Amino acid sequence: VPDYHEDIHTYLREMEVKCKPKVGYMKKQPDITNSMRAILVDWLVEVGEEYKLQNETLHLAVNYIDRFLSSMSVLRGKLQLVGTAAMLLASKFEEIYPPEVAEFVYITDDTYTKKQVLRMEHLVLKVLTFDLAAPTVNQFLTQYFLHQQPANCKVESLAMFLGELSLIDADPYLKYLPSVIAGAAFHLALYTVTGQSWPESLIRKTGYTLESLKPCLMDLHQTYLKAPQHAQQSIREKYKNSKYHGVSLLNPPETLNL
Amino acid sequence: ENFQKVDFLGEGQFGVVYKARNKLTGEVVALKKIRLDETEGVPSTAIREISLLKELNHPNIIKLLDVIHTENKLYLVFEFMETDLEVFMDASALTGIPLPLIKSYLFQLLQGLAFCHSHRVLHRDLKPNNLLINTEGAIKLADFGLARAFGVPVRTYTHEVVTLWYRAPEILLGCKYYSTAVDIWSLGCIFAEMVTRRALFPGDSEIDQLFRIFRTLGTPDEVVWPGVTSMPDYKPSFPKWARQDFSKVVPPLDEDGRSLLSQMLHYDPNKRISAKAALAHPFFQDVTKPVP
Ligand SMILES: CC1(C)CC[C@H](Nc2ncc(C(F)(F)F)c(-c3c[nH]c4c(P(C)(C)=O)c(C#N)ccc34)n2)CN1
Ligand code: NA
Ligand code: NA
Numbered sequence: 027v028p029d030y031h032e033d034i035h036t037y038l039r040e041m042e043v044k045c046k047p048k049v050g051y052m053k054k055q056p057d058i059t060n061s062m063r064a065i066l067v068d069w070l071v072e073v074g075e076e077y078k079l080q081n082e083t084l085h086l087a088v089n090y091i092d093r094f095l096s097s098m099s100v101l102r103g104k105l106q107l108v109g110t111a112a113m114l115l116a117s118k119f120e121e122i123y124p125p126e127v128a129e130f131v132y133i134t135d136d137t138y139t140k141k142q143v144l145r146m147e148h149l150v151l152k153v154l155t156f157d158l159a160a161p162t163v164n165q166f167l168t169q170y171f172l173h174q175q176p177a178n179c180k181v182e183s184l185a186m187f188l189g190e191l192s193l194i195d196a197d198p199y200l201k202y203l204p205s206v207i208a209g210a211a212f213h214l215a216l217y218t219v220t221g222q223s224w225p226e227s228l229i230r231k232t233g234y235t236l237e238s239l240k241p242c243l244m245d246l247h248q249t250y251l252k253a254p255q256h257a258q259q260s261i262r263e264k265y266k267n268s269k270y271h272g273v274s275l276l277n278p279p280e281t282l283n284l
Numbered sequence: 285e286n287f288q289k290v291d292f293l294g295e296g297q298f299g300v301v302y303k304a305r306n307k308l309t310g311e312v313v314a315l316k317k318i319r320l321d322e323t324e325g326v327p328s329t330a331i332r333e334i335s336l337l338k339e340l341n342h343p344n345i346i347k348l349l350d351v352i353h354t355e356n357k358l359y360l361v362f363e364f365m366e367t368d369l370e371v372f373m374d375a376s377a378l379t380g381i382p383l384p385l386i387k388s389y390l391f392q393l394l395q396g397l398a399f400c401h402s403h404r405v406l407h408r409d410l411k412p413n414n415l416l417i418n419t420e421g422a423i424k425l426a427d428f429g430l431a432r433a434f435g436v437p438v439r440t441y442t443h444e445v446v447t448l449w450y451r452a453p454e455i456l457l458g459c460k461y462y463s464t465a466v467d468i469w470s471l472g473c474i475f476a477e478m479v480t481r482r483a484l485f486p487g488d489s490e491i492d493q494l495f496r497i498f499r500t501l502g503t504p505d506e507v508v509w510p511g512v513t514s515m516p517d518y519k520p521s522f523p524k525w526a527r528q529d530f531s532k533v534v535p536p537l538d539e540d541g542r543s544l545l546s547q548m549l550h551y552d553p554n555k556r557i558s559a560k561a562a563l564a565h566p567f568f569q570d571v572t573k574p575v576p
Contacts, residue, residue, distance in 0.1 A: 028436060028437055028438075028463065029401070029464060029558045029560070030401050030402045030404075030464070030558070030560070031436050033402035034402065034403075034404045034436055035436075037402065037403050037404065038404075041339075080439075082435070114325070115331065118324075118326070118327075118328040118331050118332075119328070119331055119332065119335065119433070120433075122440070122441065122442050124328065126323065126324055127323070127324050127325060128323075143325075144322075144325040145355070147325045147326060148325075148326075148353070148355065151326065151331075151353065152353065155338075156331070156334040156335050156338060156351060157335060157338060157339075158331065158335040159335050159336060159339055159433050165435065165436070168435055168436055168437065169436050172436070172437065
């Protein structure tokens, strides 16, 4: 338990309300769809694997993309350019050794020029008013993992897995705050692996009961159940590796039995 | 712009700083022209500095007023501060800084740091010339270009951090993980520098820096810092010096001051006092407010 852990958690809970994107934004977008967003994020997962970037960097990029698309109309031909610049900014913010721009251009396959990518960086920064330090499902998961009396490396990877799956589907996961998704993820992971439930120590810290988490859980359970069927598979693929203890291969539970 | 360049303040790697006047409102500012000159677009240090400063509204943290961003031009507009700690110490090199003002400045500085840390920001470049003083007697942390948002718990961050003289030993000895404790070391060194008007540990190299620390605090072993002998850059051949008496290292300080200072300079980062715990230290039972 580090210094300021309760203070930081309180701060993160304030900032996740202010950093939230407009829930219904894809409806107001003339040219792009939830399905096109899914392809983008999934592609961003592959970019993270190729360049050995942190989980956090990917969650921030997604938060930037969603906040940007809340404000600006984008044509499908330009959606990947927004993601490239979001990934560049997230990397600059969070990585020790961020890919250089030349490499971001390479990973797009020369769909865009160095010039376009730099300029889109400029525009994303303007649109976000340089507010890049957003709370993520990630930051909440790592907070919650300190409250596991016996630390379980398999519960942790699986909780991360479920949190990453939530990045893919704008419907329904924009409805929920990172702290609640994380709550859902942690419980679902715990229950799957060990049969335990959302600890009494996390109820106190978060003020979230197993009962208050039910909506997000019913959604996340479903996402987990149908994950092998989902069009986008980069996340299931990623979490087969030994690094994440092959948690993507675990059979989910049929009955949550909250 | 609406800005008149009044005086040049200094060129860095990070960029150029001018004292300037708003020609319409009269407000005096410091303009940081970021060195763009840019293979990679906006520098990470610029992105971190703005994003973290926009979140840090505190009396003892520099106010970012505005950001002016075009293509091939990025300016940061800060409140202008009359003096800094480096300059005030020099103009006090003989007289001394009165203890109650030292105490007030240290209290303020800890208040700013506690606020940073509680908002998951590491400063990572504390030093006298980054600690600015205004006419109303406020001292504020500035220059957040080397800062970083940090996780609960931490992971590995950049190794080349903190100016040599203010660099915590866990960084000199190449620990995987470092956190809020490295900022507290930095402040301990500065506290000691205000008292004596000389740098506590002025190394000219990494090894020389360790040795300056060891000469004063004693060479650390498994007793006072478990795990230390296992570390990357620890050598069994290190000279085994004894901890000096603090009454000799910082003469002007009372019992309460020494106790605090030694707590800020613990070798083991786990034993080392937090900014928040330090504010509740008896040394500050009689601290006074900022006054011009
Ligand atoms: C010598 C003095 C007393 C003269 C005035 C100066 N007043 C001031 N007010 C606000 C800021 C702030 F914070 F608003 F910019 C800065 C500042 C911050 N970083 C700086 C640098 P760096 C450390 C980037 O090299 C250099 C260089 N060279 C020069 C100035 C600054 N200075 C403080 N020191
Ligand atoms: Na649409
Ligand atoms: Na915690």
